[PDB]
């Protein structure tokens, strides 16, 4: 059985405030520009997961007002999170994606008559905006995400070329810089679509992921998410076909065959164009403090291992600015005198209030903690599973201060609590 | 007469939690691909009824924590439903359907033409999205559904070919996989329309049904539904015109006749294209626990015969993903190198909380239960129309557990009840 | 104004941007309301050449 | 490596710098901020309306 953290962990009155100051990121929104050396210009987009790993100072090592209250030998200390605020800058906007060579044959919403069959390479330049999403979750461990990937066929008759690949639901760990579902599907677009011309340049060679809430809610300890908030909306603007041989033709008994110019049945693979709706400021989730009181698991906002994970997605501020640089000058506006660039800029401000907590190490409590987590007991005196993973690292070792009123979020906290 | 279940059932303080775990369905969204052998790929769509038949363990044989708290001879036991949660996965989206050859003579919104005559086979490739619908129902017996079917023509003058078929309101049982109405009506499209080119592919060969709320509410005992929620919306996007010989010509007195090419009055059968405005996370019903407090009828959430029926329709997550496979590779993007496939995937996680109840079988109670349902008495010591019906069987015989706080719905239930 | 194609419903590969393909364009802006009170003039932020 | 090369007039990839046109939705009288008094009860900072 699993017990609640309220039993063996006792909280204290020692509150602290920390903040990451301004965080900036500037880069291309579609692909990361790289010269022969490496990525000079990274890839920064508004449809990416932002995963912050904040590293906290060790409670035992750093300075305290007095050590007479706690016992160094029979007790230990951990940091617990009790509030946060995520502040964003830059004006509200909408980001536009697209593909120079996208697979789209006809717009079938409203038409007249038939036209001929597709030739070779019937591809057009298409731009659009995506489904509107904004979410934020917090936890001790990196969150899990699901997608649909190609499956491995066991020993059987060898499949002929062109067959439909088997599908599997794959669960992985979300790292910093992964894309989000955009109303086209939460699937591996690099393995399951070989033509590389069915979705825009953002996700045509990447994996879109969706948060796997069903299983992160069924974790025995619930370290993956303390809390989460989400808001999504979209609608369908346009409808169209695709060009390519149909793997599974329409059954002979579902349609009545036509003659003359209606003989060859047109393609029946229908796709739509997603679109987020009106952007507003009264629907925002950010620039607002959140007070953690009760968690949905058993782990009630207690940070193990002196680190914490914050996952953010915000597509409401995703304007791609456009820059122009003059190569030369001419008489009357030559079009080849200018060079056009795209940038996207992102700004963050993470603020937290933490609380100091103590754990009494009896024999059975020690055995229980060892069963839960061996690294916790090992550290109270190695290779982490985050060796190859990617995160945005934010260090807060020298940024703890008990002058709560001197900082904007501390005053809000003092108003809320009152003491 | 009829008496409420509250009169003759007594409730205990024993609670159990059952979870079906993750459930998946993958298949084609329009039809089912069967080779010469069998049906390898089923038909899975978001516009289908989901009927789960949940099978509970027999409380009599099931080993209770206490067997001495009840009389083994003068009393029996039965499971009473207390609360439930339906969990959906996958991101929100919309699904596009259509017909490669659909009956649409002309556009009449901002076009009206009196030029040439309508020739044979004026059909066009048309794609759309349906009406937005959500509903959830819970009961002991499968729900009733009403549609409009061809009536029986009795001993009378023999009808000529082409006469209007008589209409009848037919009530039936909603089974698994039966479609739902999409803004075209609730009729047997297979029998009332013969051309097979009037509605999209996924309904042009089946029956679309609508729940029969009036009769299910008028039922005396109240076993058809304890609980239902619905939410639907649509609007009319495009107006068009059907092509064919007109059965009932417009009366002379209603119009002033024309001349030249206006002498032939155009078709007067007017149809529209439905749509659903917007999908948003603030209008959803699922991923939320419902506490079944008081039933609408007399059956107050009592499960007779160790059965349960849960009916779900949810069109808010209905994206049809598109997969591509590469037959061959050529120099520069031939269209015939690639094969296109359509798939839909649906994921559930049903969670229930049940309570234990006991019945004292006096003379009046035995007679009343015999009048109501003889199977309940015959079981306490068999041909059933459910034998030939198709549902989704969810077995929970070895998934009952009283460790309430170790499961998410258990935590929500304990917090809500307070005690 | 510098605009070439309406990629919403277009994309035919039948031409290339020549010289001076600018067209007359009108529109309405994003809708805003704001009211600030302070003793000192407020600060503003923009993106400038480095 | 992000695209499969075309042929004929598809050989030269078209422009990929995508821009949109903003627009406010609806002007209404129930969404105004002005023509209504405001009372400064408590300031956010330390300076309390001095």
């Amino acid at each position, epitope marked *: 059985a699993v017990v609640a953290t309220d039993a063996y962990v006792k909280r204290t009155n020692i509150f602290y405030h920390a903040s990451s100051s301004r965080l900036l990121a500037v880069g291309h929104p579609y692909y990361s520009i790289k010269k022969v050396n490496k990525t000079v210009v990274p890839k920064v987009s508004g449809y990416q997961y932002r995963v912050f790993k904040v590293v906290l100072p060790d409670p035992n090592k750093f300075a305290l007002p007095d050590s007479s209250l706690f016992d160094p030998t029979t007790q230990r200390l951990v940091w617990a999170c009790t509030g946060l605020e995520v502040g964003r800058g830059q004006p509200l906007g909408v980001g536009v994606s697209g593909h120079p060579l996208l697979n789209k044959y*006809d717009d079938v919403e409203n*038409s007249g008559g038939y036209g001929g069959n597709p030739g*070779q390479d019937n591809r057009v330049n298409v731009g659009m905006d995506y489904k509107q999403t904004q979410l934020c979750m917090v936890g001790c461990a990196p969150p899990l995400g699901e997608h649909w990937g190609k499956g491995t066929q066991c020993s059987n008759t060898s499949v002929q070329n062109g067959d439909c690949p088997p599908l599997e639901l794959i669960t992985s760990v979300i790292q910093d810089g992964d894309m989000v579902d955009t109303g086209f599907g939460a699937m591996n677009f690099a393995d399951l679509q070989t033509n590389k011309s069915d979705v825009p340049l953002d996700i045509c060679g990447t994996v879109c992921k969706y948060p796997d809430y069903l299983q992160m809610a069924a974790d025995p300890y619930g370290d993956r998410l303390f809390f989460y908030l989400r808001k999504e909306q979209m609608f369908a603007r346009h409808f169209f076909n695709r060009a390519g041989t149909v793997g599974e033709p329409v059954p002979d008994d579902l349609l009545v065959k036509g003659g003359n110019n209606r003989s060859s049945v047109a393609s029946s693979i229908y796709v739509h164009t997603p679109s987020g709706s009106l952007v507003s400021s009264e629907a925002q989730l950010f620039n607002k403090p959140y007070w953690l009181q009760k968690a949905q698991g058993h782990n009630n906002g207690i940070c193990w291992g002196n680190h914490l994970f914050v996952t953010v997605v915000d597509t409401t501020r995703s304007t791609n600015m456009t820059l122009c640089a003059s190569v030369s000058k001419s008489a009357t506006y030559t079009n080849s005198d200018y060079k056009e660039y795209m940038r996207h800029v992102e700004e963050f401000d993470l603020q937290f209030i933490f609380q100091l907590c103590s754990i009494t190490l009896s024999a059975e409590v020690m055995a229980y903690i060892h069963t839960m987590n061996p690294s916790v007991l090992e550290d109270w005196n190695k290779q982490d599973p985050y060796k190859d993973m990617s995160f945005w690292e934010v260090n807060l070792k020298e940024k703890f201060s008990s002058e709560l009123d001197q900082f904007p979020l501390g005053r809000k906290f003092l108003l809320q609590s009152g003491y | 007469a009829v008496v409420a279940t509250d009169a003759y059932v007594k409730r205990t303080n024993i609670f159990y939690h059952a979870s079906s775990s993750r459930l998946l369905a993958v298949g084609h969204p329009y039809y089912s691909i069967k080779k010469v052998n069998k049906t390898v790929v089923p038909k899975v769509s978001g516009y289908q009824y989901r009927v789960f038949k949940v099978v509970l363990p027999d409380p009599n044989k099931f080993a209770l924590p206490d067997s001495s708290l009840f009389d083994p001879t003068t009393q029996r036991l039965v499971w009473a439903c207390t609360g439930l949660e339906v969990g959906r996965g996958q991101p929100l989206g919309v699904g596009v359907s259509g017909h490669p050859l659909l009956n649409k003579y*002309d*556009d009449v919104e901002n076009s009206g033409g009196y*030029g*040439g005559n309508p020739g044979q086979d004026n059909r*066009v490739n048309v794609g759309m999205d349906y009406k937005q619908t959500q509903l959830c129902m819970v009961g002991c017996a499968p729900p009733l559904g009403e549609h409009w079917g061809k009536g029986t023509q009795c001993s009378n003058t023999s009808v000529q070919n082409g006469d209007c078929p008589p209409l009848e309101l037919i009530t039936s049982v909603i089974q698994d996989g039966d479609m739902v109405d999409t803004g075209f009506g609730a009729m047997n499209f297979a029998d009332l329309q013969t051309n097979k080119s009037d509605v999209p592919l996924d309904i042009c060969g089946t029956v679309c049904k609508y729940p029969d709320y009036l009769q299910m509410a008028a039922d005396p005992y109240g076993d058809r539904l304890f609980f239902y929620l619905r939410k639907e919306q649509m609007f009319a996007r495009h107006f068009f015109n059907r092509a064919g010989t007109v059965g009932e010509p417009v009366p002379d007195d209603l119009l002033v006749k024309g001349g030249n090419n206006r002498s032939s009055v155009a078709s007067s059968i007017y149809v529209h294209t439905p749509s659903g405005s917007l999908v948003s996370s603030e209008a959803q019903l699922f991923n939320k626990p419902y506490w079944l407090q008081k039933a609408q009828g007399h059956n107050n959430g009592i499960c007779w015969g160790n059965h349960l029926f849960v009916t779900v329709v949810d069109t808010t997550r209905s994206t049809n993903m598109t997969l591509c496979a590469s037959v061959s590779k050529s120099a520069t993007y031939t269209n015939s190198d690639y094969k296109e496939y359509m798939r839909h995937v649906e994921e559930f996680d049903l969670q229930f909380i049940f309570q234990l109840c006991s019945i004292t079988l006096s003379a009046e109670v035995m007679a009343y239960i015999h009048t109501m349902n003889p199977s309940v008495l015959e079981d306490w010591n068999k041909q059933d129309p459910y034998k030939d019906m198709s549902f989704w069987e969810v077995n929970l015989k070895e998934k009952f557990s009283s460790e309430l706080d170790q499961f998410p719905l258990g935590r929500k239930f304990l917090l809500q009840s307070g005690y | 104004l510098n605009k070439y194609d309406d990629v919403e419903n277009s994309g035919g590969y039948g031409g290339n941007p020549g010289q001076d393909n600018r067209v007359n364009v009108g529109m309405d802006y994003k809708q805003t309301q704001l009211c600030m009170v302070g003793c000192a003039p407020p600060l503003g932020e923009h993106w400038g050449k480095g | 490596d992000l695209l499969v090369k075309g042929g004929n007039n598809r050989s030269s990839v078209a422009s990929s710098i995508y821009v949109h046109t903003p627009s406010g939705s609806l002007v209404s009288s129930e969404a105004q901020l002005f023509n209504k008094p405001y009372w400064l009860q408590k300031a956010q900072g330390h300076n309390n309306g001095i």
Partner: antibody
Amino acid sequence: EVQLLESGGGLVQPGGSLRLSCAASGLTFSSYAMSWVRQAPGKGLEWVSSISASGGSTYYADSVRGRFTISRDNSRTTLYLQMNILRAEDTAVYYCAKDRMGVRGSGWFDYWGQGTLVTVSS
Amino acid sequence: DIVMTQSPDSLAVSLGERATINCKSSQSILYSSSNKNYLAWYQQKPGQPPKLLIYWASTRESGVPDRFSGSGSGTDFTLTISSLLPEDVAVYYCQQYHSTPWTFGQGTKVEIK
């Protein structure tokens, strides 16, 4: 029994504008895509502009793009061409041509109009 | 842009004899999977709109006399009038509709001798 009648030709000063129209008689106008085709006096046939059956999409040539515009009137069954910023090189005869296929159409033409002459000089 | 060149210049054909006209493109027109050549042949008489003769480079229009014929593939195409009559004096054009912009030929003038 399908006919096409054109009207709108005449003289015009350079830099001025003009409008051409084409009317279809015995035809289901809402189905077939259509186009305008120019022919200089004494020269060959040259494409100008094309429109979809429902009027959603249009295509122009490089030398014509930006100045001309093609429009449709299905209720009145008429095809319009608006000419802006005319040059001296556009004096020619214009043809209203009907495609074969419907939605966007394969580019060969069944029936043609009679043609209307446009002159741009002093 | 695909340039279509009509190789034979304006040629005069004797009475009751076959006539041959060659059209050539700067790119391959054939689509290999379906074996379709995107080429059409038009006829125009002096002072009248041109009339369609051949489409898909092989198929013939309704009401067109069987005397005309078309052939070719890839980048070569030929139109042949099997027998010559006085009503066949006209100007013939070859059009490609493989890719935009749709271009016509320079036009060949066919006349009796």
